[PDB]
Structure formats: C-alpha cells, structure tokens
C-alpha cells in the first residue's frame, strides 16, 4: 500500500464519468475544511495487516497535525504494483473501518472507481506533504 | 524518474520555509490558468537519456491535451529511490531545457528545495491524472 499524506486547508471532489464499468460506490461530491487528504493506492498483497498498519499511521500523523478530518481518497497512481479493483475497493473499505477504531474525528472515504475532479489547498509546513508505504 | 501528470484548470504555489540549507533556487510564488502540472521525482541514475524521454512524453501528452502551459513541480514523494538533491536539481534544470526543445508553450519550473503551499483544481476527465516512469 502506498499513501500520500496532504495536509489541506480545504479539499473538494466531484465524481465525473465512471472509470470501471459498474463503479461500486455511488456518484457524488463533497467538500471539506482543514483535513488530512490521504491519496491511497492499494497494492497487490495488501492484506489485513497492511490495513492495520496504515490505519494506525494515519491516526498517529493526524494526531500530531491536530487534524480532526481525514479524507481517504482512492488513487491509482502512486504505485506500479496495483491490486485489482475489486480487491482495492475491499481494502479501502477496511482501511476506512480500521481508521475509525484508531482516530476520533471525521473519516470520509471518497467514491472508488469514478473519475473525479478535485481541488486542494495544501499547506506548506514541513509535515504537510509526506509519503508512506505499508506491506505485510 | 517518476512523474505525475495533473491537468489543471488552475495552479498556484508559494514558497514557505526552506527544506534544504541553501535552496538553489530563489524563493517566490506563481499562479496559472489551465496547465499540465507535472509533479517530478528525480530518481538515482536518472541521466540525460531519462531527461529526453520524459521531455518528449510531457510534450506529446501536452499536445494531445491541447495545453499551452506546463509546470515542472519538483516533488520528493513519488518514489523510494530518490536522487540526491544536487543531482535532482540538475536533472530538473535539464528537463526544463529539454522540454523547450519539444513543446512550444509556457514552461515554468517551480523553485527546488523550498517547502511550498500550493492549490490545484484538477480536471476529472479520463486523461487528467496519469503517472509515468522513465529510466535509462
Ligand atoms: N489499486 C487501486 N488503489 C486505489 N484506487 C484504485 C485502485 N485500482 C483502481 N482504483 C480506482 O479506480 C479508478 C480507475 O482506476 C481510480 N481513479 C483514480 O485513481 C482517479 N482519482 C485518478 O485517475 C480509483 O478510484
Ligand atoms: N529527488 C528529488 N526529486 C524532486 N525533488 C526533490 C528531490 N530531492 C529533493 N527535492 C526537493 O527538495 C525538497 C525537500 O526534499 C522537496 N520538496 C517537496 O517535495 C515539497 N513540494 C513537498 O514536500 C523538493 O523541492
């Protein structure tokens, strides 16, 4: 699993056209104030262990940043070892649930498999932009 | 070399605090209308060949998108095989020059080694977000 952590002043996205056949999530759109935006690429052989490590790390980083909102944003582009879409969707769902056990604020998982426009205003402090890798 | 191609409606950045010791570029800030934003991670053993492949690909993608502005945005986070900063700066400079030989519009290389805030409004069409890897 490869993550990009962007500490945002604001974030918004809107689903456009699908990028699968039947995307597994409904279309939709959402916008946020200050949040940690976590661009999330599920990799082959990401499993339950990987999910728990990533959840714990997002929680711990969020805690030090003092953010109360985390966006889990499915993203195909951070890796060249992708999990298949069906598995990736499932791991993203589990990540979202595992995060709620570890982090007390708002957790929003964006729709999987839709093309989306988005807008972010990313902070420029030293911890505002970080990458993480998790394996098992 | 690992690239992320974001086809933006608008992009802006502002340098905040440095992230090296003496950053090699001056501080500053800039904003743009529609552009291809190319987040660029220089990897160990990126050389002149790599630069020319990447330049040609950015040019060709830009051409099909019909964009007339390319932002080369130094980015440390897309890879786990980074080139050292001094080499990375040099390759980024060469990429910028090699791009001008291949693409006829505005080329802007953002300051290397500064922390920066930024804002992007990224399009949601099917080619708006792509990743590339180049080696030699
Ligand atoms: N292994 C994986 N990890 C995370 N997300 C994945 C995935 N495989 C498929 N996706 C999702 O399907 C859309 C098209 O591939 C993907 N869409 C996107 O990545 C857009 N935001 C940018 O192109 C994404 O929703
Ligand atoms: N191998 C490499 N490829 C591309 N850029 C590189 C680099 N090594 C160092 N940098 C630059 O130094 C800043 C801190 O590492 C980096 N700053 C950034 O990556 C911020 N935009 C986000 O943290 C970047 O300017």
Q: Which of B16, B123, B129 sits opposite A125 (nearest CB)?
A: B16
Strand bridging mode A69-74 / A106-109: parallel
Q: Is there a contact between B126 and A115 if contact means CB atoms under 8 Å apart?
A: yes
3-state secondary structure of B93: helix
Closest CA to A57 of A93, A7, A109, A5: A5
Taking Cα atoms as reference points, which of A38, A45, A108, A104 lies closest to residue A75? A38
CB-based contact A3:A40 (threshold 8 Å): yes
Q: Indicate yes or no: CB of A123 within 8 angstroms of CB of B117.
A: yes
**Radius of gyration in angstroms for the set of CA atoms belonging to chain A, rounded to a whole number:** 14
The DSSP 8-state label assigned to residue B105 in this structure reads: S
Q: How far apart are CA A63 and CA B127, in angstroms?
A: 35
Rounded to 10 degrees, the C-alpha dihedral A76/A82/A85/A86 comes to -140
Experimental determination technique: X-ray
- Token digits of residue B124: 């949601």
Q: How far is the CA of B33 from the centre of ligand 1 (A)?
A: 26
Of the listed ligands, the closest to the CA of A91 is 1
Which contiguous run of DSSP H or E holds residue A77? none
* DSSP H or E segment with residue B132: strand B129-133
Question: Of the candidates A125, A131, A114, A133, which has an alpha carbon nearest to the alpha carbon of residue A34?
Answer: A125
A74 CB under 6 A from ligand 1? yes
The DSSP letter of residue B80 is S
Rounded Cα distance between A75 and A69, Å, is: 18
**Quick one: B61 exposed, middle or buried, by C-beta within 10 A (0-12, 13-18, 19+)?**
buried
Lookup: tokens for B46: 């990126």
Inter-residue contact B114 to B15 (CB < 8 Å): yes
B103: closest CA of chain A, how far (Å): 24
Which residue has the CA at smallest separation from atom 22 of ligand 2?
Answer: A129
Give the contacts of A97 (CB within 8 A, at least 6 positions apart). none
Q: Compute the Cα dihedral for B17, B37, B97, B44 and give only its sign.
A: positive
Q: In this structure, what are the phi and psi dihedrals at residue B112, rounded to the nearest 5 degrees?
A: -90, 140
How many whole angstroms separate alpha carbon B71 and alpha carbon B69? Answer: 7
Domains belonging to chain A, first-starting first, are: 1-134 (3.50.80.10)
Resolution in A: 1.9
CA distance B107 to B71: 6
Gap between the Cα atoms of B106 and B3, Å rounded: 19
**Measured between CB atoms, does A31 come within 8 Å of chain B?**
no
**Type and span of the H or E element at A37:** strand A35-41
Contact A79, A2 (CB under 8 A): yes
CA distance A14 to A114: 9
Helix, coil or strand: residue A21? coil
């Amino acid at each position: 699993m490869r993550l990009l952590y962007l500490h945002a002043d604001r974030f918004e996205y809107k689903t456009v056209k699908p990028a699968l056949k039947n995307p597994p999530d409904p279309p939709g759109e959402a916008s946020f104030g200050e949040a940690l935006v976590v661009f999330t690429t599920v990799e082959d052989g990401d499993g339950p262990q990987t999910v728990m490590y990533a959840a714990s790390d997002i929680a711990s980083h969020s805690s030090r940043l003092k953010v109360t909102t985390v966006i889990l944003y499915p993203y195909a582009h951070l890796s060249s070892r992708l999990a298949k879409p069906m598995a990736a969707h499932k791991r993203l769902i589990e990540l979202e649930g595992a995060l709620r056990t570890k982090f007390p604020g708002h957790v929003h998982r964006a729709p999987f498999g839709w093309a989306k426009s988005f807008s972010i205003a990313c902070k420029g402090h030293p911890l505002a932009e970080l990458s993480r890798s998790f394996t098992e």
